[PDB]
Amino acid sequence: EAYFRVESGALGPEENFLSLDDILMSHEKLPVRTETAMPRLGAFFNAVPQGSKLELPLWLAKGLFDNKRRILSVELPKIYQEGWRTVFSADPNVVDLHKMGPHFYGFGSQLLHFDSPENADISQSLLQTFIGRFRRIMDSSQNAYNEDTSALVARLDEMERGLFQTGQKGLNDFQCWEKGQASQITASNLVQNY
Amino acid sequence: ADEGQARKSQLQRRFKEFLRQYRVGTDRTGFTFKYRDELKRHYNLGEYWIEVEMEDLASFDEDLADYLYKQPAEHLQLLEEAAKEVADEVTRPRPSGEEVLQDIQVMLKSDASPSSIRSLKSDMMSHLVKIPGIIIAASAVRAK
Amino acid sequence: QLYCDRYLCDKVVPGNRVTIMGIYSIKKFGVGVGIRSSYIRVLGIQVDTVSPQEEEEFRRLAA
Amino acid sequence: WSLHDSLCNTSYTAARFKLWSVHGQKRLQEFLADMGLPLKQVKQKFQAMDISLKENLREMIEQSANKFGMKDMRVQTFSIHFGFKHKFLASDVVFATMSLMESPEKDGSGTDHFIQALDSLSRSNLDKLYHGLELAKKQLRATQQTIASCLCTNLVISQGPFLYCSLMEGTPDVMLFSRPASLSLLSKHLLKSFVCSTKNRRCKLLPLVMAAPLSMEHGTVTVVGIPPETDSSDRKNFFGRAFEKAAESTSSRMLHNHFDLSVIELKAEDRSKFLDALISLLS
Amino acid sequence: VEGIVTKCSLVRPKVVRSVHYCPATKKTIERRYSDLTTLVAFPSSSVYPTKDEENNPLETEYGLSVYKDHQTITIQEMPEKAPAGQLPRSVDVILDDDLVDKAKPGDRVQVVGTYRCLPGKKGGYTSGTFRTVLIACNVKQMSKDAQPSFSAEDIAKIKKFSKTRSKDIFD
Amino acid sequence: RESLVVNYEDLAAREHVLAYFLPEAPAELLQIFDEAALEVVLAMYPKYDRITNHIHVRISHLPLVEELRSLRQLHLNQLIRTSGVVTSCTGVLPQLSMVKYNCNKCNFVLGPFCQSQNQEVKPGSCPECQSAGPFEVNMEETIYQNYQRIRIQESPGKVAAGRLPRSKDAILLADLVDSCKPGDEIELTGIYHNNYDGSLNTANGFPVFATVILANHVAKKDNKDVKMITSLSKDQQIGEKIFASIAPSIYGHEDIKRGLALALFGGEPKNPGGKHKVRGDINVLLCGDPGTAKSQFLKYIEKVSSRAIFTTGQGLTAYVQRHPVSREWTLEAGALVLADRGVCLIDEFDKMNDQDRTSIHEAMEQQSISISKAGIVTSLQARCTVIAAANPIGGRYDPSLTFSENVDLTEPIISRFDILCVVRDTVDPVQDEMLARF
Amino acid sequence: MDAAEVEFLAEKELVTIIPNFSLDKIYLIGGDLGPFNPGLPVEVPLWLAINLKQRQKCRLLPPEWMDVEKLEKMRDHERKEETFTPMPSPYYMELTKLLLNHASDNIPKADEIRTLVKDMWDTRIAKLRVSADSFVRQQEAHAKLDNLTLMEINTSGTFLTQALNHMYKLRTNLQP
DNA sequence: TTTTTTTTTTT
Numbered sequence A: 001e002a003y004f005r006v007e008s009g010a011l012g013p014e015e016n017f018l019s020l021d022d023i024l025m026s027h028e029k030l031p032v033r034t035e036t037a038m039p040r041l042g043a044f045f046n047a048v049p050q051g052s053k054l055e056l057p058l059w060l061a062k063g064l065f066d067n068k069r070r071i072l073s074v075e076l077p078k079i080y081q082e083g084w085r086t087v088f089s090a091d092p093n094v095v096d097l098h099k100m101g102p103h104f105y106g107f108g109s110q111l112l113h114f115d116s117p118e119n120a121d122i123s124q125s126l127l128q129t130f131i132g133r134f135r136r137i138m139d140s141s142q143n144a145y146n147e148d149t150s151a152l153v154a155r156l157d158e159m160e161r162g163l164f165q166t167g168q169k170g171l172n173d174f175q176c177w178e179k180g181q182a183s184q185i186t187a188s189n190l191v192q193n194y
Numbered sequence B: 001a002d003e004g005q006a007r008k009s010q011l012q013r014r015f016k017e018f019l020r021q022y023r024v025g026t027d028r029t030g031f032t033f034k035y036r037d038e039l040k041r042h043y044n045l046g047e048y049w050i051e052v053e054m055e056d057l058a059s060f061d062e063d064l065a066d067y068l069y070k071q072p073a074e075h076l077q078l079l080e081e082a083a084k085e086v087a088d089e090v091t092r093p094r095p096s097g098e099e100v101l102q103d104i105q106v107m108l109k110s111d112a113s114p115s116s117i118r119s120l121k122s123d124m125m126s127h128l129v130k131i132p133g134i135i136i137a138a139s140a141v142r143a144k
Numbered sequence C: 001q002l003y004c005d006r007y008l009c010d011k012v013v014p015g016n017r018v019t020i021m022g023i024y025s026i027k028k029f030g031v032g033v034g035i036r037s038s039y040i041r042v043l044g045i046q047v048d049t050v051s052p053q054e055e056e057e058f059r060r061l062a063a
Numbered sequence D: 001w002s003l004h005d006s007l008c009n010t011s012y013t014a015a016r017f018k019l020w021s022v023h024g025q026k027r028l029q030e031f032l033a034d035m036g037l038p039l040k041q042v043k044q045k046f047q048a049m050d051i052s053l054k055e056n057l058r059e060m061i062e063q064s065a066n067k068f069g070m071k072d073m074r075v076q077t078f079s080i081h082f083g084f085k086h087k088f089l090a091s092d093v094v095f096a097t098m099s100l101m102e103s104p105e106k107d108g109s110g111t112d113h114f115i116q117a118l119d120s121l122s123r124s125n126l127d128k129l130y131h132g133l134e135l136a137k138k139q140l141r142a143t144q145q146t147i148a149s150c151l152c153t154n155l156v157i158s159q160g161p162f163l164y165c166s167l168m169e170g171t172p173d174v175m176l177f178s179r180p181a182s183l184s185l186l187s188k189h190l191l192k193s194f195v196c197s198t199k200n201r202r203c204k205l206l207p208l209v210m211a212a213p214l215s216m217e218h219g220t221v222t223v224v225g226i227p228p229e230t231d232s233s234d235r236k237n238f239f240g241r242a243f244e245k246a247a248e249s250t251s252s253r254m255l256h257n258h259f260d261l262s263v264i265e266l267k268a269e270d271r272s273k274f275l276d277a278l279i280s281l282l283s
Numbered sequence E: 001v002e003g004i005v006t007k008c009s010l011v012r013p014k015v016v017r018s019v020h021y022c023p024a025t026k027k028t029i030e031r032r033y034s035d036l037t038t039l040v041a042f043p044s045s046s047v048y049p050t051k052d053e054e055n056n057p058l059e060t061e062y063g064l065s066v067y068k069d070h071q072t073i074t075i076q077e078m079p080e081k082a083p084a085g086q087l088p089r090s091v092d093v094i095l096d097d098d099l100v101d102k103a104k105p106g107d108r109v110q111v112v113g114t115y116r117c118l119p120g121k122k123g124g125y126t127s128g129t130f131r132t133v134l135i136a137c138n139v140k141q142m143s144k145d146a147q148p149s150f151s152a153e154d155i156a157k158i159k160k161f162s163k164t165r166s167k168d169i170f171d
Numbered sequence F: 001r002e003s004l005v006v007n008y009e010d011l012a013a014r015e016h017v018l019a020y021f022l023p024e025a026p027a028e029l030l031q032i033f034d035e036a037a038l039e040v041v042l043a044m045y046p047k048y049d050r051i052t053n054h055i056h057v058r059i060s061h062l063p064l065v066e067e068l069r070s071l072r073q074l075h076l077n078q079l080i081r082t083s084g085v086v087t088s089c090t091g092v093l094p095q096l097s098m099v100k101y102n103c104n105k106c107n108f109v110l111g112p113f114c115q116s117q118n119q120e121v122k123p124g125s126c127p128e129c130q131s132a133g134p135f136e137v138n139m140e141e142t143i144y145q146n147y148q149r150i151r152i153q154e155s156p157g158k159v160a161a162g163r164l165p166r167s168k169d170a171i172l173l174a175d176l177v178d179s180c181k182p183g184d185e186i187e188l189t190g191i192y193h194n195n196y197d198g199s200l201n202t203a204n205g206f207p208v209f210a211t212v213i214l215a216n217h218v219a220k221k222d223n224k225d226v227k228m229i230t231s232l233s234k235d236q237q238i239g240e241k242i243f244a245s246i247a248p249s250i251y252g253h254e255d256i257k258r259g260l261a262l263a264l265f266g267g268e269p270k271n272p273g274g275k276h277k278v279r280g281d282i283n284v285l286l287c288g289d290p291g292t293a294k295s296q297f298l299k300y301i302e303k304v305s306s307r308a309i310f311t312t313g314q315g316l317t318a319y320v321q322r323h324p325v326s327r328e329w330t331l332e333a334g335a336l337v338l339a340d341r342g343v344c345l346i347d348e349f350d351k352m353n354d355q356d357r358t359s360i361h362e363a364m365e366q367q368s369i370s371i372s373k374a375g376i377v378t379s380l381q382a383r384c385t386v387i388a389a390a391n392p393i394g395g396r397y398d399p400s401l402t403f404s405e406n407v408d409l410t411e412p413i414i415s416r417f418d419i420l421c422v423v424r425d426t427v428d429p430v431q432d433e434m435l436a437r438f
Numbered sequence G: 001m002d003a004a005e006v007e008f009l010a011e012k013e014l015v016t017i018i019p020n021f022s023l024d025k026i027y028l029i030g031g032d033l034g035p036f037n038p039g040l041p042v043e044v045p046l047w048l049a050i051n052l053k054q055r056q057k058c059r060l061l062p063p064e065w066m067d068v069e070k071l072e073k074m075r076d077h078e079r080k081e082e083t084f085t086p087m088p089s090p091y092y093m094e095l096t097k098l099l100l101n102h103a104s105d106n107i108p109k110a111d112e113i114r115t116l117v118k119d120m121w122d123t124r125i126a127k128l129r130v131s132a133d134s135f136v137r138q139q140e141a142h143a144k145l146d147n148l149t150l151m152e153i154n155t156s157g158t159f160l161t162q163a164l165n166h167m168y169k170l171r172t173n174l175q176p
Numbered sequence H: 001t002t003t004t005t006t007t008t009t010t011t
């Protein structure tokens, strides 16, 4: 109630520095093709050729990128390719955005700092998927009371679980006021140890 | 014949005032409308079924919960046609994609002592029974 | 013999314990001269009966 | 309860009908048949019994109990309604509270049950009352299975001026009556069943004295004393003096710990040393 | 629908039009047929008129009529997708019009067809129970079971490698 | 109970004229007696109307016990008393008793016709819209009654002297259903009623009618205070006195008498508190050369015990069977589920088949069978004590080898037996007289 | 916010009681009260009427808008109109909870007032999730809520605003 | 969808 973690800026211009969600977000891998040799460090993948397909975290490919593609170029995973961008248009209420994740909107908004050609078509997928999956999170979260919700929440990602936990915290708080139950003073964080 | 529908239009009105009025909880703590809220919370999720309890129906209006034990066939219909007229005045206006009112399968449970298969004498023909057992088979779903 | 319906279908699996509330009735598809068949039209059914923190008692024990 | 399980357990029709001897169990059957109560409705819970029977039940029962020698069958009490389904008789609250405070299984100090029973008297806690009615049932079905022991085995000794009994640990459901407060009711129902059972004319007017083991480690038992039973007993007990003077004479180890005097804890070895001096003292 | 084919039926014709002829009047009348396995679903009778008007006799002409093929297969749920507690469910498909022999027992197909219920009546009294079928209008074998789709780049590589060295290519 | 018994002999004593009218036209006297007993009971218990409002009077031991093969056409529609085993029973099906239809064009219910057990009832034309058509029943006002059909047949050795055993049908109505199971020995008492069948006429070529006994009273003939037993058990020496009470004829073997007596009463089937399910059944396995009254030890325990069954090893589990009467492919009980609490007497244990062997062992340490047969997947109960006797190989038990050799039995099976008695023999002069004389 | 502070803001509404004790004017930091003449009406803030009722020192009175007839017209007016219609008091839910729980015997026909209030509530909540779905569905940037009371706002606000922020972000991530 | 009898392939 007073532990206010630093929130995630993974949807705006640039992720926050201290947010433990973005730190684990950017760690996810991404495919690149190198433009030069990689001397003195070919141990991991001593030198590495130019024109080689490698898998690197996102944070690494932040500074190793330039406009001229001096060191390496990037190509998007298939989840954001043209293939799946039609699937997410058929009916977005069917996809398991936890397997295709578990950071869909967080990752996809950082792949816009690579000035690829099809950006005007990724920032339209996300917008049209989130709008598609809305009337199923506005209604399965404000209307699921004293139920086992661990199956209404099995196909969501970190940007959506944060909302499914705000619908419930406002349902279970009006239903606790209606029953004269939110008058008793209780232990706040000690019942967490118990 | 003409008194038939005139009784029904007076039962389908007393089965509707039960869902619309039955509460629980005391006066010290606070109350809770038990079946309107479940109708709404099951409709908005897209489930279309409530679970009426026979003790409640008995304690509200004593005659209805007796008809329901004697003539369950022709009274479950009135119950399920009042559940549909209450689920209409509770969830409306439905937002955009649905505007046709669905049909509410009213199940019902109870807390009463169970009979047994060996105690199904023919005088129990068309009376609510309550038997325990063990499922042994299962057909494949079909249309009807 | 039972007869389940819209939302009671695929609710129980062969091997379960249940408690049926049904309308004992007769088939009307119209050994003896006036014998009928009989079933129970079910309209109520019942059934009789990994973690994050659990992960750590594996972690520390492996460590 | 059901209408059947509450005739077999009230210690006022479980005495007259003699519902512990197969010879008189048919009396209950005849009583039920004389009213037109199907044996299948009487076995089911009362809230689910058909509506056509319960019209004048409380009169067709008082009548058909004259034909059997039970004329004090209607009493004067009160009842409360809260809401839609909440309907209590003033002698259900009592049997539920009295059994939340004296539950056998102990979960802490002596003042852990007291709190849970004080809780269940306000209307904001109908979930404890409605729970303390499943203990009060479990107790009443485990009392007629003890008064059925000491009357199909004749463990009521006629030790002279007073009857006498005792209990055995091996019998099931005898650790439930270990408390020194839930033992007085068992004895006071035992006397009521006995006085109706025996054929003598002397035993029918002698007070009872009962002992049951308290503590195996200290090796001690608990002892009570109840007035001579009758219909119009004045209810003026006299054992708080007898036990005192008897322990004084024998000079044994006793404890008058409670507030009432007629309940004592006694060494398992000073039983006879105490009892003989008491027999002589009451004379 | 996805899943395994576990039987097939015997391919049989099925009329969709007749062409009759009057040897007396030298005319030519036709007749259009339809059953419950169409998209329009009117049950026509296969009476094959022999005397439209009682005066003249008729005679069918099979060469000028129109028949079509008709099969009936049974898809069944994949084994590794069943909850393993039951006998996996099935469904009936009605292939047609040169979709016919496109599936043999033991395959993994993805039929794409309309879903339909077809009623009946034996003696003017119908049980409410119906039988539901799938009037397929496409079929796909899921597993690719061949490797002929070489790229022109691949055949280029191949004709290179086969020419590079004829001495040491076997070893 | 709505069923009153009227012993016939007293009816003949106190009444000279009715006890002669009765077995002549009993389809109406047994109807008048109903309305008499009703008005009597409703006077002795004026509220009994709330219990079934209808009384049937049975009749006990007519003086004319009869055979089942000597029923000729003289007895059509006459009260009759017979005897014999019952060999089938359908399930308790509900039959119409006071039917009541409803018209399809007027929403009016037709007259309450009664159902007679020879011909389907026929409603006329609607007296409200003259809409003569195919009416359907009205499940809410119709009255039903239980129904069951059994096939009785002559007792095995009683009358079937030098011929085959005949059989007959019987129809048990409301209160009687489930009064008897396949294998019971009963003695019917019922009108012997005939009815026309169109099939027999097409097989025999002559107008021939079928017959059936509308049973009116079923009284089984089978096998169904402590103050003595107190001191008799307190003899302190009841062991010797009981050992020589079983095996009443067969001399000797006070050794195996002990073990079998131990087995008969059993032991205690305690439930271990560690979820280990120890069993409380004593299983015995005799063995010994031929001619030593093993089979008699089995047959006498068939008698003395209760709810016992028997089998040879030359049917052990429930199997699909086409019912004789109902003509449905049902499931019938085997031979290890009919001893679900008593004993199972196996004979010729050696002659069991591989399926039989793999099925017998399962029930020893689990006492529970599963049947995923063509009928349906079930899991039933079987708690029986097994009493069997094997044979020695080579026509003689020879004690040079271990017993696990002369028995010819799979090794993990002998472990499933508690006692292993070995019957043996020897030429002994002093016992030759003892056994001969006996 | 949270319901237990809307309930705090709602205990400032004025109600009318009938005391049965003598007391002279009190000068509260939020006004004046009294004098309390036994058997004579006086108007006080709720948090005092409730607290005096619990101590058996008064007898409440039903507010005028709390009539079983005018309410049976509000309940129909609400279902006819297709926008949020004006309501008797900005805090009617909390009034008809606190009053009817603590003074249900001084209010005639409490268990019909209660059901009509709940009927109104169950509609004004249905209009919200339609007015909060067209917003997203059509990607608006403004929405005029007409006569929403603070309680309806607070029951589904901390979800709606939090799910519109994540939409503004997704809709303006391509400009730079 | 059951017995019983008779021929031929198969473990």
Ligand SMILES: Nc1ncnc2c1ncn2[C@@H]1O[C@H](COP(=O)(O)OP(=O)(O)O)[C@@H](O)[C@H]1O
Pocket (backbone or CB within 6 Å): F249, F250, F251, F289, F290, F291, F292, F293, F294, F295, F296, F435
């Ligand atoms: N000691 C005995 N006392 C009485 N009868 C005996 C004795 N020994 C053998 N018999 C006779 O032998 C018969 C039993 O043979 P049985 O044990 O069944 O042979 P098998 O074991 O080869 O089947 C009995 O009918 C009985 O008459």
Ligand SMILES: [Zn+2]
Pocket (backbone or CB within 6 Å): F103, F104, F105, F106, F107, F108, F126, F127, F128, F129, F130, F131
């Ligand atoms: Zn008609």
